[PDB]
Amino acid sequence: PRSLKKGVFVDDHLLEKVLELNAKGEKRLIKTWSRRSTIVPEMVGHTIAVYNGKQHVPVYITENMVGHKLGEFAPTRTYRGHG
Amino acid sequence: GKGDRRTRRGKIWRGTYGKYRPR
Amino acid sequence: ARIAGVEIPRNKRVDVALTYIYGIGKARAKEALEKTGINPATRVKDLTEAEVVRLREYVENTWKLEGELRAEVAANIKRLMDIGCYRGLRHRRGLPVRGQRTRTNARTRKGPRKTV
Amino acid sequence: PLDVALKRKYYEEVRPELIRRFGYQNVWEVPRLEKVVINQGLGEAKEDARILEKAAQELALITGQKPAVTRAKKSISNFKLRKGMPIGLRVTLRRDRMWIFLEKLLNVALPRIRDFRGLNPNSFDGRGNYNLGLREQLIFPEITYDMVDALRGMDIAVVTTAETDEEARALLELLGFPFRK
Amino acid sequence: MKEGIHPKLVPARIICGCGNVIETYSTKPEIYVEVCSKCHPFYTGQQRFVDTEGRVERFQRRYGDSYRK
RNA sequence: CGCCUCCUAAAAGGUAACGGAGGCGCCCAAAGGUCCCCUCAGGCGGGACGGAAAUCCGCCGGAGAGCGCAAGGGUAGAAGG
RNA sequence: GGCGACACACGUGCUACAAUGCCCACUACAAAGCGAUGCCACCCGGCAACGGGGAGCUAAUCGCAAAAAGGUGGGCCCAGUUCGGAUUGGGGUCUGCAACCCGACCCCAUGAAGCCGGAAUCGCUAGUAAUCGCGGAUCAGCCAUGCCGCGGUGAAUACG
RNA sequence: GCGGGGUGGAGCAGCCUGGUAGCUCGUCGGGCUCAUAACCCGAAGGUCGUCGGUUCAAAUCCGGCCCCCGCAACCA
Ligand SMILES: [Mg+2]
Ligand SMILES: [Mg+2]
Ligand SMILES: [Mg+2]
Ligand SMILES: [Mg+2]
Ligand SMILES: [Mg+2]
Ligand SMILES: [Mg+2]
Ligand SMILES: [Mg+2]
Ligand SMILES: [Mg+2]
Ligand SMILES: [Mg+2]
Ligand SMILES: [Mg+2]
Ligand SMILES: [Mg+2]
Ligand SMILES: [Mg+2]
Ligand SMILES: [Mg+2]
Ligand SMILES: [Mg+2]
Ligand SMILES: [Mg+2]
Ligand SMILES: [Mg+2]
Ligand SMILES: [Mg+2]
Ligand SMILES: [Mg+2]
Ligand SMILES: [Mg+2]
Ligand SMILES: [Mg+2]
Ligand SMILES: [Mg+2]
Ligand SMILES: [Mg+2]
Ligand SMILES: [Mg+2]
Ligand SMILES: [Mg+2]
Ligand SMILES: [Mg+2]
Ligand SMILES: [Mg+2]
Ligand SMILES: [Mg+2]
Ligand SMILES: [Mg+2]
Ligand SMILES: [Mg+2]
Ligand SMILES: [Mg+2]
Ligand SMILES: [Mg+2]
Ligand SMILES: [Mg+2]
Ligand SMILES: [Mg+2]
Ligand SMILES: [Mg+2]
Ligand SMILES: [Mg+2]
Ligand SMILES: [Mg+2]
Ligand SMILES: [Mg+2]
Ligand SMILES: [Mg+2]
Ligand SMILES: [Mg+2]
Ligand SMILES: [Mg+2]
Ligand SMILES: [Mg+2]
Ligand SMILES: [Mg+2]
Ligand SMILES: [Mg+2]
Ligand SMILES: [Mg+2]
Ligand SMILES: [Mg+2]
Ligand SMILES: [Mg+2]
Ligand SMILES: [Mg+2]
Ligand SMILES: [Mg+2]
Ligand SMILES: [Mg+2]
Ligand SMILES: [Mg+2]
Ligand SMILES: [Mg+2]
Ligand SMILES: [Mg+2]
Ligand SMILES: [Mg+2]
Ligand SMILES: [Zn+2]
């Protein structure tokens, strides 16, 4: 994945919105367009609506889903099976 | 075994190096 | 079921015989032979009980093997499947996980073809 | 009668500890081992193998006792089973052989179990007895890899003079039965 | 017991892989076993064998706290 | 169309109709004689492969099982194993 | 975000099913090209992908660069295997604002199908077929097993 | 009333002798052809009209019921 020599990647503009909610008293829904952004220990507890190209998926964030990206939890493809 | 990366021949095929084909 | 829960093939060289254990490849086999000071070229049918009890004790204590290793692989997937991540979806529909094409091939993840 | 490790342990450490933990007013009210009945439900020797004497010979090594045959009480289509067919073995270990078996089972066999995370606590009769199952017979020390042709497990029944599960749970753990919960 | 149909039980010595010797009775006087109660991880208290890991995930990153705040 | 079982049959026996319902025309060399042991179906719980049901353990269970085949009578204080 | 979907169906391919083989070590012989936020000698940290230094060269000077098959030796001993390298777990490297969808590479573990392929069907007549490595264009990187080139070793057979 | 049947989509075996569902056609996949038919190579699909019963087990033996075929329904 991303080289350990560099930093843990969050789009900062989103990381900003997270911290502001922790201080001022959390929490509300977060419209984001950062699927490329990493889930982070501060994001835990909120619910972030992640856009998949079409809609924003209401994603609750927990402890076990820290190291992943926001995009893994917002499916991009519609599929109900074949035939 | 031109496909097995854990061999001499395998890294030749990939054109890469490593423990199994060092430089 | 000598070491480590598997009874390694006799009449074969001790280095390869270890590869028949879950959790051990050729790599961890080259290791345990120096770290226990045993000749890699000798057969297991020619191992001293001293050489045996040492190789056994080391390998069961240095690495996670058989049922436990299978347990964590299962535990690792169980969570990925449960959190609802993409890696989990692919484990729940049995489809290829590592971003391969699914238009053709993919026969190892799915199973033999179901024609139509 | 032979003095054996697990037997002597019963009277010296296990016997008293129980009178403490439960407070019995009579010496016989205390839990005793009644009998250990080992059963190989087999049935793989129905039509195919009229020859299962290997398993009898195997059980004869394990328990120092020749098992008896169990036969089909009634005919059954689905199991390809006609009334009176020989489908299993059962040896009843009592007294010193009962101890000797449990002693080797507790100290040697149960450990040699693949991925042994402790006997199941919930396998208790309710009436104060215990039953457990093994999937291989290689678990026992007397059985080398050479003398085994094909795998076969068994059922083990341990009967207690105890009235309740709790009393039964105690007696066995004290004797050295490892439970997971 | 019935004579001639039963295996003879005699004093026995089951030798474990930790060197432990068990005084018992068996159909064979000498036996070598790879494990016993005195060295099996489930038995010996709670020997973490090889996996003293502590999960380790998911908070086990901390790689690092250098991101901006 | 002869034979066996139940009902009709009116609490002895018997009792008809092209009245209501089923069986027999075999079988077993043990499925016979005797002596000695043994006791079921089913229910709940427990037990590797083992399942509603294979074999094992426990508790309850007067007989509802079994007795070669129809039915009835009988029957574990055996006629059952 | 999609173009990378996936109950399936076809074409073109890659790597195989092994002993005329596979692996480890040591040792040879090409050609064509490319290369100034470009190729990077050598040096040191890491098993390694790489990372830090750092010499040279607008290149018949310097570098990519080792050619590989071959050769000397040792191992494997006919087994789904030291054949085969798919699939999956985990730890990492690199580019790039960013590798969830959706990159390549490295290391540990996992070690699938596959025992030479039904009906059918393609190519090649000599330095050819077969087999082995190497370079370039595009291009941050790369899903190239594609394409366009280049040499090594090097056949069988054509009655008609 | 008497005899005979109901089983892949179609038409027939299997039933009598209980365990073991078969043949032709059609159907789907792939070949050959420009394409098509034919032809070749593969594969799928019947819990046996039902409801009951005998048995260890029923397409198979037995009974009820539905449906279809054939014969009979005379002296009046
Ligand atoms: Mg290989
Ligand atoms: Mg292994
Ligand atoms: Mg890919
Ligand atoms: Mg895909
Ligand atoms: Mg006493
Ligand atoms: Mg219980
Ligand atoms: Mg009791
Ligand atoms: Mg054994
Ligand atoms: Mg007569
Ligand atoms: Mg009467
Ligand atoms: Mg009367
Ligand atoms: Mg009467
Ligand atoms: Mg009267
Ligand atoms: Mg009279
Ligand atoms: Mg008799
Ligand atoms: Mg009789
Ligand atoms: Mg009689
Ligand atoms: Mg019962
Ligand atoms: Mg039960
Ligand atoms: Mg079970
Ligand atoms: Mg049962
Ligand atoms: Mg009765
Ligand atoms: Mg009858
Ligand atoms: Mg896209
Ligand atoms: Mg496209
Ligand atoms: Mg290709
Ligand atoms: Mg090829
Ligand atoms: Mg295999
Ligand atoms: Mg195979
Ligand atoms: Mg292999
Ligand atoms: Mg991974
Ligand atoms: Mg990507
Ligand atoms: Mg072969
Ligand atoms: Mg070939
Ligand atoms: Mg082919
Ligand atoms: Mg020509
Ligand atoms: Mg080759
Ligand atoms: Mg190339
Ligand atoms: Mg280039
Ligand atoms: Mg590039
Ligand atoms: Mg009529
Ligand atoms: Mg029909
Ligand atoms: Mg007929
Ligand atoms: Mg027949
Ligand atoms: Mg067709
Ligand atoms: Mg045209
Ligand atoms: Mg055609
Ligand atoms: Mg019926
Ligand atoms: Mg019956
Ligand atoms: Mg029936
Ligand atoms: Mg049938
Ligand atoms: Mg009928
Ligand atoms: Mg007339
Ligand atoms: Zn020990």
Keywords:
part of a larger assembly, 5 chains, A: 83 residues, alpha+beta, 30s Ribosomal Protein S19, Chain A, three-stranded mixed β-sheet, 1 helix, 3 strands, 14% helix, globular, E: 69 residues, mainly beta, binds magnesium ion, binds zinc ion, RNA-binding, tRNA-binding (chain C), Ribosomal_uS13-like_H2TH (chain C), Ribosomal_uS13 (chain C), RNA-binding (chain C), ribosomal protein (chain C)
Please explain how this structure is put together.
This is part of a larger assembly, with chains A (83 residues), B (23 residues), C (116 residues), D (181 residues) and E (69 residues). Chain A has one helix spanning 13-24; strands at residues 29-32, 47-51, 56-60. Chain A is built from one helix and three strands, in the order αβββ. The longest helix of chain A has 12 residues, at 13-24. Chain A has one domain (1-83): 30s Ribosomal Protein S19, Chain A, CATH 3.30.860.10. In chain A, a hairpin with a 4-residue loop joins strand 2 (47-51) and strand 3. By secondary structure, chain B is an all-alpha fold. Helix content of chain B is 30%, strand content 0%. Chain B starts with 7 loop residues before the first helix and ends in a 9-residue tail after the last helix. The radius of gyration of chain C is 19 Å and the shape is elongated. Chain C is built from six helices and no strands. In chain C, helix 4 crosses helix 5. Chain E contains no helices and three strands. Chain E is mostly beta strands. Chain E has strands spanning 10-15, 21-26, 30-32. Chain E starts with 9 loop residues before the first strand and ends in a 37-residue tail after the last strand. Chains in contact: A-C, A-E, C-D, C-E, D-E. Chains D and E meet through helix 3 of D and strand 2 of E. Residues 1, 4 of chain B line the site of one magnesium ion. Chain D binds three RNA strands through strand 1, strand 3, strand 4 and strand 5.
